[PDB]
Amino acid sequence: QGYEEGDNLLYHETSILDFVRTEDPISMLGEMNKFTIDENDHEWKILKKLKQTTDEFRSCIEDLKVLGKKDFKMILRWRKIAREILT
Amino acid sequence: HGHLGFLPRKRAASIRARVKAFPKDDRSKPVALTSFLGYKAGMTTIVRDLDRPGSKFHKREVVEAVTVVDTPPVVVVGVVGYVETPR
Amino acid sequence: SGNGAQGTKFRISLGLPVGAIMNCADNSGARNLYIIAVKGSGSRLNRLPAASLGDMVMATVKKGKPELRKKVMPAIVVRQAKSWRRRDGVFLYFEDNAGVIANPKGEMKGSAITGPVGKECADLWPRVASNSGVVV
Amino acid sequence: SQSRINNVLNKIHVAQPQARDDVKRTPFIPESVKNLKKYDPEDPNRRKLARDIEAENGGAGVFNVNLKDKYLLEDDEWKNDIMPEILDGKNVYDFLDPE
Amino acid sequence: ANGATSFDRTKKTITPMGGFVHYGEIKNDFIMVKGCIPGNRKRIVTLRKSLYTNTSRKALEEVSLKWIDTASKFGKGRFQTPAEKHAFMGTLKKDL
Amino acid sequence: MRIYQCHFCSSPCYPGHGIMFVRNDAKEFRFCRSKCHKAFKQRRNPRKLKWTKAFRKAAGKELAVDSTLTFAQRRNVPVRYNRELVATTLKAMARIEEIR
Amino acid sequence: MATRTQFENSNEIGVFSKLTNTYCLVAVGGSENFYSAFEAELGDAIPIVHTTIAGTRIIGRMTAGNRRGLLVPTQTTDQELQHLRNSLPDSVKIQRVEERLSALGNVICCNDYVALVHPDIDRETEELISDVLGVEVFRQTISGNILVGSYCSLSNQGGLVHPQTSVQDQEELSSLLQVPLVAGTVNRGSSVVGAGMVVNDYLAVTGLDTTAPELSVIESIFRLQDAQPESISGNLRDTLIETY
RNA sequence: GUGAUUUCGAUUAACGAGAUUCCCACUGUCCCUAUCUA
Ligand SMILES: [Zn+2]
What we know:
Chain A: Belongs to the class I-like SAM-binding methyltransferase superfamily. RNA methyltransferase RlmE family. SPB1 subfamily. This is part of a larger assembly, with one copy of chain A, two copies of chain B, one copy of chain C, one copy of chain D, one copy of chain F and one copy of chain G. Chain A is mostly helical.
């Protein structure tokens, strides 16, 4: 059905913080390719010392359109934990 | 349908196909065999570094299917003379 | 290879018969391209003409702008889902089927192409090569 | 006609820079390019061109130019050498590096 | 080094891993011919000299081979030699 | 030529072998065989599939970081051809594979 | 030094060749007429390399660089990288980049001191440009056109952009580049100008269909003749007005 | 003799192994065949 007018590279990346803070994550996960990581950001410095941040979370985050629904649900759980931390 | 020059579509009289024309002889050249016998032993693939001026694949490498024919040396065991006749 | 192409074109597996709708990958304002004919197509009885990567077809715009609709125009196929063999040794394929509008001389109507363009199409059409951002 | 005047400007107008500080951006012309003698198409003693070499050897479509002849190497005998690339499932170029 | 070229330094013969299917290894002289020929494996074949002096540049051009595929033909072969297969997989249970 | 490695299981990909998929974001996934290609299309996780080098290195079946393993990378800066350098490379490759 | 030629009867010299001040890259295909056309003017002064990029001939579109360095896409093979390295002198850096926008000639419009790049390229390739080519990177769309390298031919002396460029865009780009700019055509009215012609500070090559007025404009902006300054617009003006 | 009912000879909801033109979805009907089991 064609391509977007404002989309040149057909590449959509946002911030893991933007994912954490957005209210509707379903459409974002549908229309994102990657979640970039900043190691000089204090929120990410906080979230680096968590149980689910390490292991295969980074590999599942570096790409999105190869993931399965189980990987996506794990990502949703990680964002949920990050949200909870945030007379 | 079909190429009418390959009729009739009958079984070959032998398993070894006959050579029905040898190269035209040139008496000045040294003595050489015109033909050899081998056994077909499978196929494989090669990468050829092509040198073919004029081609779009000049100075480029292509992948080719090849056939391997097992050819141990043949043993000479006889000689037969032929005379030409009006028949 | 018709008029406008650069040199000889080798055989590539056919993916897009007549009556197929592909994406339009340029910024000309078309959304799809419906194939009505394939240029340089040898005739065989009871066979649908089909197009491959690097081919020039004649297409209408089923979805797009009202000005661009209703008119048969030349297009060039730049992506095919059907896998084809590259002579250096790879079988490869793209995610969808995509083409770009063009004039009879092979010049691109739009300004740029979005997505990867087939290497064969880019090396055959210099204007496609000029307007490509990603070539495989 | 005054209406045609507005269309002239877009093509005839040439815009200069504002010189943006003292950063020097001078045109580079090589000394060999400077001292190169102009090629005269009808001149007896002129350098032999690549198409001339092709015509002398085979002509277009049959001549086979050696692309290793203009290689700049520490040794000239190395120009006609095969560079290996596969060894036991490894790419040689991957292991190729100084020290 | 039947299957080794100037570009591929792996010392290996022409025989693919596991042998040709329905035909053993090649331990004699052999002819590698471009393309396919009539017949199937094990069939006796006759190779004849060209009947005419070929006027094609194809008959003249030298062949420089870069690599010969010696992967197994008995499946989706990934390794050219058993040494490469072992170096990839590593140490298996029966190696210890 | 170039020996690639499978995007799924990391097994070597030789000329003609396997299949390549080019995604719209223009990155190329090379698969050594249709097994890996079909698992990718099914969207299975190689890090979960025990028969892949990704899983093995993730779970500790084999070493992921090593002095021998640092020798081979994709060189993006070419070096001038030097016969002595090539011969030294050919020796060192065998030595390194033995040590590994 | 403005000359005309064709590659296999094609007018797009910028597609099939790359010209800088210290080297020239020429597609290998066909015969040696194109190579010898370059060599007749250039002499043995600078390297002229028959090169192939990923098995293709579109090297002025797949490759980017200037007198200092050369950039090739990820699709470039090791053999081609080695061939380029053995051909060019060590004074030329040669770098292969992992950029998703592979058509470096299209996505980078550069010269010896400043690069105009595609807006959406990444910081990694911007840093690579600034490091290997020794230039300053600017994300800018020429008249709102993707592929600045395709729609603009640039040099240390001047620049030719596609005619649709607005006057404000011309002024802004001229200030960012510090070379005089002209909106103009090539190859009898072709908008794609960088991909239609190669140019460096002392030579320009364009398709055989380049008309005399277009050739004069090109030679004026690129300052090929020593005697003619940037001010000859006041002397070509009558011809240009009569043409348009 | 007409065949529900209503409204203005026309009109009418519900229903139909009744008739006709298209749409989505789907596909070996087809391009163009190929293979497996009994
Ligand atoms: Zn697998």
